[PDB]
């Protein structure tokens, strides 16, 4: 009954329906594996259709502590408190959790996104103000009999499914390949190799993980360390040289459009990200097609064409495998076994020539540890 319980709009995040307070106040909350704070708009804002009204909740408890959270994009400040929370289209349980009441924000809420809050699903180590603020999932597991695990199937209006407490076999095909969660703070993993159209980038694998690599459903793009990003773009341009695009495109500052239905998918290469396996020197790879890294930008004004933005960008905080990477894959966040599984999704991207895939195992003779720290 949790299938297709996610909605969203490209580049604006995926959200699930939740209720906070008593009586229940329904709100759409963005699913974010890239942070650990559960926060909801709690005051009027230009882009908010509704918000959390603490005065109307008889079960609310103020913690008398303020909180500030800065993201890559946007930031907000609010008041900490606790209240009862439930997930209509999820496990039928009610738990008391910490909630940050957003009273001030900057470039956080998105006009027309349809969500009013965020659910940080990562670990307490990155929660603000500090790790003593128990994240929502932790509270959920402690207070209920929900297994310490959740899976996300993001599909490219959009939708998807967030299965809490288990794995839904009808949401993927083939095998599930697991990569270790290197450290329990962000969902940190290790990339051991990167290929652009079968051609290895030939780089010390530590570069791919400088200073860390994570799985973040709350970030749109595939963000790469400067060195890797430059190498990647050079290779993608080479592969697509039959057409020349302005530098602004490769910088993600400009759209590229083609007449409706004529996008030349074939001139863009497949990007392979090899992830560390559960066994020494073993790995598996997930393949990304341009249908994933060329994000469609819907606009009625430009509807005679199909327009896209390059969804691969530079980062100075490590590799971020965002939503465009997760789309088309069934991703299992097995917190109980400190590992993340990937499998081809029931809504995977593909055309008559290529398809997104999860393949393994691959072996490496190199004995180097790809971990940066
Ligand atoms: C979906 C909206 N699009 C985005 C979002 C973000 C972004 O910062 N997302 C937040 C959550 C968030 C913030 C605002 C609105 C919605 C969700 C995420 O937690 C960061 N995780 C991090 C990176 C791990 C940081 C967590 C900080 C906390 C203090 C732990 C970056 C994007 N960018 C920036 C350039 C490329 C790109 O795609 C595009």
User: Token digits for 32?
Assistant: 């974010």
**Residue 169 DSSP SS3:** helix
Q: Which residue has the tokens 């490496």?
A: 364
* Nearest alpha carbon to residue 151 among 109, 187, 97: 187
Q: Is the C-beta atom of 313 inside 6 A of ligand 1?
A: yes
Torsion of CA 273, 275, 215, 234, to 10 degrees: -30
C-alpha 13 to ligand 1 mean position (Å): 9
Tokens for 10, please give them.
């490209």
Distance 352 CA to ligand 1 centre (A): 33
Helix (H, G, I), strand (E, B) or coil at 89: coil
- Whether 182 and 304 map to the same domain: the answer is yes
Kindly list the strands in the beta sheet with 319-321, ordered across the sheet, starting from the edge strand earlier in the chain.
Answer: 188-189, 213-215, 319-321, 222-225, 312-315
Q: Which one of 119, 146, 173 terminates a domain?
A: 146
Structure tokens that stand for 267 in this block: 């001139």
Indicate if 187 and 119 belong to the same structural domain.
no
Calpha distance 34→340 (Å, rounded): 14
Which of 210, 185, 188 shows the shortest CA–CA distance to 120?
185
Here the contacts of 52-58 (C-beta below 8 Å, separation 24 or greater) are: 52/20, 52/21, 52/25, 52/27, 52/99, 52/101, 52/116, 52/117, 53/21, 53/25, 54/21, 54/81, 54/83, 54/101, 56/21, 56/23, 56/25, 57/20, 57/21, 57/22, 57/23, 57/25, 57/83, 58/22
- Phi and psi at 336, nearest 5°, equal -60, -30
32, 83, 138, 306: which one is catalytic? 32
Closest atom, ligand 1, to C-alpha of 13:
1
Measured in angstroms, the resolution is 1.9
Examine residue 289 and state whether it is found in any structural domain, yes or no.
Answer: yes
Q: Is residue 97 part of a domain?
A: yes
DSSP for 11-61, please give it.
TS-EEEEEEETTTTEEEEEEEETT---EEEE-S--TT-S----GGG-TT-E
Q: For residue 31, how far is its CA from the centre of ligand 1 (angstroms)?
A: 11
Mark whether 123 and 197 lie in a shared domain: no
Tell me the β-bridge partners of 344: 173, 329
Residue 334 is assigned to a structural domain of this protein = yes
Of 95, 120, 146, which one is at a domain's C-terminal end? 146
Out of 4, 83, 138, 216, the active site residue is 216
Residue at 266 is within a domain: yes
What is the atom index within ligand 1 of the atom nearest the CA of 223? 36
Select from 125, 146, 167 the last residue of a domain: 146
C-alpha 356/C-alpha 362 separation (Å) is 17
- Report the 10 Å Cβ neighbour count for 96: 13
| 135/151 same-domain check | no
Its sign, for the CA torsion 6, 183, 202, 314, is: positive
Does 113 sit in the ligand 1 pocket, CB within 6 Å? Answer: no
- Any atom of ligand 1 within 6 Å of the Cβ of 268: no
d(CA 278, CA 178): 7
**DSSP calls for 330-345:** EEEEEGGGTEEEEEEE
Task: Take residue 335 and report the two structure tokens written for it.
Answer: 């917190």
* Domain residue limits at 142: 14-146
User: Is 2 inside a domain boundary?
Assistant: no
Residue 253 and residue 339 in one domain:
yes
Which of helix, strand or coil describes residue 317?
Answer: coil
d(CA 297, CA 258): 12
Query: Is residue 8 assigned to a domain?
Result: no
Burial label for 246, CB within 10 Å (0-12, 13-18, 19+), is exposed
Nearest CA to ligand 1 atom 25: 71
Where is 256: in which H helix or E strand? strand 256-259
Q: From the alpha carbon of 74, which atom of ligand 1 is closest?
A: 14
Q: How far is CA 355 from the centre of its chain?
A: 21
Measure 58 CA to ligand 1 centroid, in angstroms: 33
Q: Is residue 9 part of a domain?
A: no
Coil/strand/helix, residue 93? coil
The coordinates were experimentally obtained by X-ray
Q: Which of 194, 335, 333, 339 is nearest to 278 (CA)?
A: 339
**Pocket of ligand 1, candidates 30, 71, 133, 310: which has the most ligand atoms within 8 Å of its Cβ, to mutate?**
71
Any atom of ligand 1 within 6 Å of the Cβ of 129: no
Residue 362 Cβ < 6 Å to ligand 1? no
Question: 135 with 35: CB under 8 angstroms?
Answer: no
Do 236 and 135 belong to one domain? no
- Ligand 1: atom nearest CA of 108 is 14
Phi, psi of 255 (to 5 degrees): -85, 150
103 and 78 belong to one structural domain: yes
Q: Under DSSP, is residue 10 helix (H, G, I), strand (E, B) or coil?
A: coil
Q: Which residues sit opposite 272 in a β-bridge?
A: 195, 287
Residue 114 has which token pair?
Answer: 């349809």
With CA atoms as reference, report the closest residue to 139 among 188, 182, 83. Answer: 83
Same domain flag for 23 and 111: yes
Shared-domain flag, residues 130 and 222: no
Q: Identify whether residues 134 and 226 lie together within a single domain.
A: no
Q: Are residues 208 and 312 in the same domain?
A: yes
Breaks (C-N over 2.5 A) in the chain follow: 156
Catalytic residue status for 299: no
Q: How far is the CA of 76 from the centre of ligand 1 (A)?
A: 12
Residue 12's CB: how many other CB atoms inside 10 A? 17
Q: Enumerate residues 6+ apart whose C-beta is below 8 A from 233.
A: 250, 312
Query: The domain that contains 135 carries what CATH number?
Result: 2.40.70.10
Using left for φ > 0, alpha for ψ between -120 and 50, and beta otherwise, residue 278 falls in alpha
Q: How far is the CA of 219 from the centre of ligand 1 (A)?
A: 4
Q: Quote the distance between the C-alpha of residue 68 and its chain's center.
A: 21
CA of 22 to the centre of ligand 1 (A): 30
Identify the burial level of 314 via C-beta atoms within 10 angstroms of its C-beta, where 0-12 means exposed, 13-18 middle and 19 or more buried.
middle
What's the number of domains the chain is made of?
A: 2
Rounded CA separation 297/156 (Å)? 12
- Residues written for the chain: 373
Radius of gyration of the chain (CA): 21
Nearest CA to ligand 1 atom 12: 218
Residue 5 belongs to some domain of the structure: no
Note whether 105 and 154 are same-domain residues: no
- Active-site residue flag, 369: no
């Amino acid at each position: 009954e949790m299938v297709d319980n996610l909605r969203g709009k490209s580049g604006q995040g995926y959200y699930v329906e939740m209720t906070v307070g008593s009586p229940p106040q329904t709100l759409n909350i963005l699913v974010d594996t890239g942070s650990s704070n559960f926060a909801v708009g709690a005051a009027p804002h230009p882009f908010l259709h509704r918000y959390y009204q603490r005065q109307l909740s008889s079960t609310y408890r103020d913690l008398r502590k303020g909180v500030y959270v800065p993201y890559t994009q946007g930031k907000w400040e609010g008041e900490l408190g606790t209240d009862l929370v439930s997930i209509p289209h999820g496990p039928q349980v009610t738990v008391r959790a910490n909630i940050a009441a957003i009273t001030e924000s900057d470039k956080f809420f998105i006009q027309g996104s349809n969500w009013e809050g965020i659910l940080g699903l990562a670990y307490a180590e990155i929660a603000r103000p500090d790790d003593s603020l128990e994240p929502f999932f932790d509270s959920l597991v402690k207070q209920t009999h929900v297994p310490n695990l959740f899976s996300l199937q993001l599909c490219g209006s959009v939708g998807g499914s967030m299965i809490i407490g288990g794995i839904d076999h009808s949401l993927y095909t083939g095998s599930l390949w697991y990569t270790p969660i290197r450290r329990e703070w962000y969902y940190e993993v290790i990339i051991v190799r990167v290929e652009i159209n079968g051609q290895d980038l030939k780089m010390d694998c530590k570069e791919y993980n400088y200073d860390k690599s994570i799985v973040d459903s709350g970030t749109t793009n595939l963000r790469l360390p400067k060195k890797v990003f430059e190498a990647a773009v050079k290779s993608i341009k080479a592969a697509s040289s039959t057409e020349k695009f302005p530098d602004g495109f490769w910088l993600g500052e400009q759209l590229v459009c083609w007449q409706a239905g004529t996008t030349p998918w074939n001139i863009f290469p497949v990007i392979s990200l090899y992830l560390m396996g559960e066994v020494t020197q073993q790995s598996f790879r997930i393949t990304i097609l341009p249908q994933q890294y060329l994000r469609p930008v819907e606009d009625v004004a430009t509807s005679q064409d199909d327009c896209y933005k390059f969804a691969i960008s530079q980062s100075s905080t490590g590799t971020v495998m965002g939503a465009v990477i997760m789309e088309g894959f069934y991703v299992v966040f097995d917190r109980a076994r400190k590992r993340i599984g990937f499998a081809v999704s029931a809504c995977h991207v593909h055309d008559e020539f290529r398809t997104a895939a999860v393949e393994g195992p691959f072996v490496t003779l190199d004995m180097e540890d790809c971990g940066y720290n």
